[PDB]
């Protein structure tokens, strides 16, 4: 690329992999959202929580793709693997799966940051710090807070209803 | 001091001690606030309740220091002892500790008022009555009300969640 | 902690130490502020300057404590040592002591940043850069500017009055 | 009086004496104000400072007289002695004389409060605390602050001009 400068092939590939991870996460959240919209699950606050996260993860992927082009790298897309479950159990189960997912995304961000540091790519490092790393820490703290409240509420049906009504 | 009039060395020293007590109380409330912000505690209403009290106690100390200077006394600061606990247990435990703390502050105010009366210092007496004594009585009544509601709510997890959601 | 990820015990402890340093600095500024409010000192602009700094340092400590919880670390508080002086001398003396204090806080921030870099903790590194490092550089530049103006003004009483009236 | 209740002849007389003291103080401040308005003195800020105090002391006297009537006592007026000086010297001299005057008024208030306490007259005690004692403490602190600034400014002519321009 005529514009490419200080942008390694290793980072370019890792960015494409991270796009795939963010799109997969968006897909997982889409599935979580619609599961909580089932008439036999019917927790609207939980559905809304996960639909908003599907939106956030898609936006993350789009920001990465914008950055790939800004740097002169080439976006390459792969299949998006279907989510790991078809049914997501209770709100507690779902929130546990969400924190597992976010910790994996965070680890991928940290790995990419390490790669950028190793490659002396400060634009990449700053981009991640500015748009992704703090967003992830805040979201994981919020999920942990939710998990703690859900756990203290387990008369499990009553507790699940109250959390959806009064927290979400 | 060129302005000092009817202001005993005994009152001046007791005011400095009371500043220290109010700052210690602010510090204790700071610790309480952040404990309830822990991801494994996660009671935001409780965190907010104690953070607002940390602010109130600091403001109290500052008012005392302003008064010390208005009277021509000299502020003298001492170390602030760390709070008595590192972890504060349940909301019930915390509210019990808060009422113990406020009763101690109130007793110190009453002791200082008695000293002012003994020293025939009506400005001091009025200052305490106007800015501190009623504030303390109101706060202790509110804490007692909270303690009673928390106690009636002990399915203890459920009760702790509902109090934070519906009262705080 | 269920949320803790890439957050070393070394950083967690250093953050707690830095909270203590920021709270100690707030306390020092509280003492400076009230000294300049003494009827026999009576430099209101100087009092206001240091009271605003006491507020800034407390806010810094609170931001650190918020971050400690976001990362899944545990806040631990220690005694707050009383300020190093009971009386602070002239505005020049006070401003010299303030720059010494800020340079110490800045060094602690730089030490913690180095630790974060060594531990490959980019969230910590970014947090400090974003909220603390530039704030410190700006404040130290402002103090240095003030020190230079105070020094050029030493008829020392006249100079002290004019600085408080026309700069602060 | 048909309305008089718990109001001793001793307090009634002391209130009349205190009215006289407040009116005398107003007169003294009137003289101070106009001295600083002399073409060969010409310190407008100082003139304004003392004219506002003449107003405050007259208002104090009127509040006392209103209270005397509310309690069923009988106002009795005496001659108002002319102020102690015809010419008031420098701003420093004047501010020294003003603090002497206010300390005397404050002592009279404290004496009357003691008398009210001895006579078990809480309405009197509260009236003084609410309308006079804190006003006096604040005014004496302000005068002490002014005296300190005037003293640090003594090139005495230059210092007198700057204080009037930049403080008053
Ligand atoms: C003394 C001030 C700075 C303080 C210390 C600790 C906790 C809260 C405070 O306001
Ligand atoms: C007593 C009133 C009329 C009075 C006299 C002298 C100076 C000021 C005053 O308000």
Swiss-Prot record, chains A, B, C, D:
Query: What Gene Ontology molecular-function terms does this entry list?
Result: ferric iron binding; ferrous iron binding; iron ion binding
Q: Where does Fe cation bind?
A: 52, 55-56, 59, 62
Can you tell which superkingdom this protein's organism belongs to?
A: Eukaryota
Keywords linked to the UniProt accession: Acetylation, Cytoplasm, Cytoplasmic vesicle, Iron, Iron storage, Lysosome, Metal-binding
Single GO biological process annotation from the record: intracellular iron ion homeostasis
Give the gene name.
FTL
Tell me which species this is from. Equus caballus
The compartments listed are: Cytoplasmic vesicle, Autophagosome; Cytoplasm; Autolysosome
Protein name stated in the entry: Ferritin light chain
GO-annotated cellular components: autolysosome; autophagosome; cytoplasm; cytoplasmic vesicle; ferritin complex
Q: How does it assemble?
A: Oligomer of 24 subunits. There are two types of subunits: L (light) chain and H (heavy) chain. The major chain can be light or heavy, depending on the species and tissue type. The functional molecule forms a roughly spherical shell with a diameter of 12 nm and contains a central cavity into which the insoluble mineral iron core is deposited. Interacts with NCOA4.
């Amino acid at each position: 690329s005529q514009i490419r400068q200080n942008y390694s092939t290793e980072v370019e590939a890792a960015v494409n992999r991270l796009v795939n991870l963010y799109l997969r996460a968006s897909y997982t959240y889409l599935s979580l959202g619609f599961y909580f919209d089932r008439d036999d699950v019917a927790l609207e606050g939980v559905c809304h929580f996960f639909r908003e996260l599907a939106e956030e993860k898609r936006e993350g992927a789009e920001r990465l793709l914008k950055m790939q082009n800004q740097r002169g790298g080439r976006a390459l897309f792969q299949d998006l693997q279907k989510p790991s479950q078809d049914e997501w159990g209770t709100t507690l189960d779902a929130m546990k799966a969400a924190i597992v997912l976010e910790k994996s995304l965070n680890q991928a961000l940290l790995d990419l940051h390490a790669l950028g540091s190793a490659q002396a790519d400060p634009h990449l490092c700053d981009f991640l710090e500015s748009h992704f790393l703090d967003e992830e820490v805040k979201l994981i703290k919020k999920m942990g807070d939710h998990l703690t409240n859900i756990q203290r509420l387990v008369q499990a049906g009553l507790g699940e209803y109250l959390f959806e009504r009064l927290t979400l």
